[PDB]
Symmetry: C6
Subunit: 248 residues, 6 copies
């Protein structure tokens, strides 16, 4: 209430405004990290593939699960049948190895757009994953195999479970992400826990906060897989995994 300049007064009165929380949360969601647009990816696949899109997509996802995004490098070190088919799919769908643009269709983006399929496939193919049971068995007992892939973050619910459940599932999953990031990213070779976490913090939060894949389907699927119990809280293995990550 002391005398001030007209520019100071503007700053002061600006800050006396009430916050419009609905509007501020809209803005914050529009400006938040987004790693991919799953509806865009699926639309591109289906429109290009027609009646072959489902079978084609499954093959691309197995590649993403087991070899990642590096199409050319990987195709040089794989069976002839696998390489021929992967190269043909790349030409057919315009697959690329890096997400340069919203339009970029990478194998990992395809996997993340269909997360319930991808994570079931990961569990089924757990013996083929670069970071799978062998690695996780050294860290804890009974790491959920559905968590051993880049798509599991999209299946962690925010609605229909407690915030403690959400946090625990994120931590349990971080145990795999931490390991996968370190094995596959050479820039993380000497990084601290906090540094490797920050390399996947934004993509993980974006996957969890996404509205594309409905929370109720996530909860029901996690219950069916036993990752959540019938009461909607994490299984013992999930709690052990989460504890292991917090302790890391």
């Amino acid at each position: 209430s002391n005398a001030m300049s007209e520019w100071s007064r503007i700053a002061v009165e600006f800050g006396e405004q009430q916050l419009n929380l609905t509007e501020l949360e809209d803005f914050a969601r529009e400006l938040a990290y987004e790693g991919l647009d799953p509806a865009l990816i699926i639309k591109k696949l289906k429109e290009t593939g027609g009646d072959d899109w489902v079978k084609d997509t499954k093959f691309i996802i197995v590649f993403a699960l087991t070899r990642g995004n590096k199409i050319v490098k990987a195709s040089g070190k794989m069976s002839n049948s696998g390489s021929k088919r992967l190269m043909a799919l790349q030409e057919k769908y315009g697959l690329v190895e890096r997400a340069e643009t919203r339009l970029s269709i990478t194998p990992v983006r395809v996997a993340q757009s269909l997360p319930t399929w991808t994570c079931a496939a990961a569990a089924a193919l757990k013996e083929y994953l670069p970071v799978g049971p062998a690695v996780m068995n050294l860290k804890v007992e009974n790491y959920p195999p559905e968590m051993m892939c880049m798509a599991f973050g999209s299946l962690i619910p925010t609605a229909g479970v407690s915030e403690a459940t959400t946090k625990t599932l994120m931590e349990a999953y971080s145990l795999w992400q931490d390991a996968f990031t370190k094995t596959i990213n050479v820039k993380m070779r000497g990084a601290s826990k906090t540094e490797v976490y920050n390399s996947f913090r934004d993509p993980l939060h974006a996957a969890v906060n996404s509205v594309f894949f409905p929370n109720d389907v996530r909860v029901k699927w996690l219950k069916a897989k036993g990752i959540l119990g019938p009461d909607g809280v994490p299984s013992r293995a999930a709690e052990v995994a989460a504890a292991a990550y917090r302790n890391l």
Copy 2:
């Protein structure tokens, strides 16, 4: 009083002059670190924006709070709606990503020019901040959410509170600045506490010493938020935060 040359005598007599403290403090304030001119920023926004400037500014501040200054990089990884609006605002206001000049309007400069609004918005949007409750909860209990942003330094008062209060508030805030600097600045990756502090010492002191945002408004606002008690000393959470930083 021994014989000396005429040049030595000049140096000696120069040093026998009394100091004009009023004049010396004027000089020292004119020459001190200044990071931005808030009146200049607000004038530019209001003159360009007219009756849209307030709503536009709020959106720019949410961006600054949650994504920082990197307009192009961030716009590549966000919703279409957010990116379209941010790009349009950049063209409209001439927003830039680095403070090259007094005239450079960066998103962070906009936030710092309206600090009471920005810090209230930060608390409201604390779950969206890159360095927010999750990080600070690992360090101490109940870190004030209003301190979780680049603008809080401007709200630390020098008049109307004790110097011990000023120092405590600076230390409590440094706990967040230290963390934020380390997460966002890769050059600080292996830096000591003292090195990361020195990266923000001058901007912080300049914010605290600024005459643009009146001290009495700062005190009243900190009391309203509970960061200061009714007696004008820091809350327990502020003291705990400050202790944690001194101990770091």
Copy 3:
């Protein structure tokens, strides 16, 4: 079961499909790491060499066992007789020093294509190996000399033995691979156990999972060499080696 968009519904229904495990394992095998095609190598050798191919191949394998892949560098530091013959063989078979392509015939690829011969030859020539009994005797007692070469991975069976046996043999062999990788690869100079393992994980798993060299021949050969006992479990030396690697 809540209302959702048509793109969300597609993702949801995609994930409600049953997995075709036979088809998914086919895909995963086609896309898995493959380091070489042994039938291709042998066909090239035999078609080029005719009735000289066997004797020629044995000489190339001794080179691979004792000097590795670096044809030019090694030929500069060896007897005249050895160098002359190696250079002539290189011209004759189109030998190269790096596996650039499926077609690239490297000395190590030749050795790996004939693994029972190569590993018997390694044991016979153990005093000539760069990483042989002297190195392994410092780590454990009685390291199997047949394991002291790049081809042993192809002789670890997956069928006809328990999975515990397979795992133990892989670990026992890793003790040599770990040492060999460190001595020969300068990029691994400061690498952790996990980092050097990951440098040979994919080639090792590919050798073990290969269908080219029949599992029943592997089991019978390991029994004949005493690496497996008559009951089909690993010898004591193999168990000690495996324990040493786990403990490393």
Copy 4:
């Protein structure tokens, strides 16, 4: 006294000469490190400035005390009034940022040429110094504020005090120099105590050994400031500071 060659004999007889100590000390003083010529600096200032030189010089010194030598960089981050005046002074006096030549007028050289004024001004402006009471209060209690600047070395006497007093004052001052060197010089980031000392050893000894600023004026000034007691030995704070540096 054994037979030797005529060249050996010359070397031997050269070394049998008596030393002319007066002449040798003259040579050693002429060849010793010199960082600046204060009479030259003052002459340039006064001849250029005329009746404005005193007020102009005081402003340049406040800049040197608080911002150092980096005229352009600092002027980009300061008030408009400060920047305008500093730039005008640079043009007027030919100020430069690095001492390339005896003629180079840097802000720090100006401060060092008028050391009693500069150190009194430093104490008066101690709350504005980049390395001031906050930093020194963490190291010891009651660090003399007159020592918190680049000019204090010129005020350490060699005549009129004991050599133990001279040494103690140099050590007490080194405590600040050590800290200032580390904060401002990034090349010293990982340097040992001995390495950072050697970065200022020659300039410090040259300041102490300079004949420009008379020893008797130094002693009298240090007594007036309480840095020396009436008996001409260092105050308790000086002894504590010196002990802290020796212990560092």
Copy 5:
């Protein structure tokens, strides 16, 4: 005995062949590391030098023993007489500083081609060696001076002594090689024991395995020097040296 493809069968039958050990050891010797051809060196020296070759060779060997291979660099820092003669010898014999080719005559190659002379000369000139008694006296007592040079490896016998004796002599010698490698090779500056050993493993084994210098002459010479006792086992000093290397 299960059905397999014709390419698999070829690999299987290839491995059922008996090994021809005589032939395999011939191949392994032809392909083994060879560092130099001593007969070639001696032939070149004698044919170029005629009746001056012996005296010339002795001078070249003293250079190799005391200064190594760096002819130009060393000649810049030595007496005029030494430099003039060394340069003339270089022109006369085509001496070079690096073994680029079988034909390259380096000073060290000359020394290694005449190893009994070289090692006797090393002992005689032990006070002139860069790595001599001063260095070795810090490691153990009574290090054999004949071992203090690059040629001693050629005098370690494989026939006429036990394999334990051969191994002990190699280890005793490695104590000097380890030290010499570290002092002269700057790339080994931070290398581990194993890394510096691997830098000389192949040259050392090649020297020991060479058939050029007869084993019976080696044994007799080592007995004459007391490095072997009359029973053909290593002296106490050799055992102490070997123990010191194993313990290093």
Copy 6:
């Protein structure tokens, strides 16, 4: 005595020759490290300088003692009188900053050519030396000031004293050389004791082994300075210094 080839026999018989020790020591001295030719330096100085050469040389030596070899860099930071005279001397004698050639006259080479004068001058000017009593007083008590310079090595005798005395004097001197090397050579910044020793081992041994400056003059001078006692063994201070270096 077994049958061998004619080239082997030549190598064997070469090694059966008796050593001519007088001739071998001549060769080893001619080929040994030599850092400078003092007679050449003195001849150049005297022939150029005529009757001014003595006074000129003394000035150059004071420069070498206090500032080293860096003529241009040092002249930029010294009194006008000193710089003018040094530059004139450089032109007059063709002084250079690096010993590129036998002919190169560096200030340090001049000092080393007249070592008894230089070391007496060093003691006289000990308060002006970059590495003097202040540094050495931290290491031991009463370090001989005559040892605080680059020329002292030339005054360590090999004849007229015991070898234990020679060794002790070398070690005592190494304590200063070690310190001086570390302060002045930035490449030695993280070097081990052994690495910094090896940087001056050859120059030191060459100075001690030089025949230019007669041993009897050295002994007599060290006795006159008290570095040797009347019995020709090192003073207590020398023994303490030597012990300190061995312990370093």
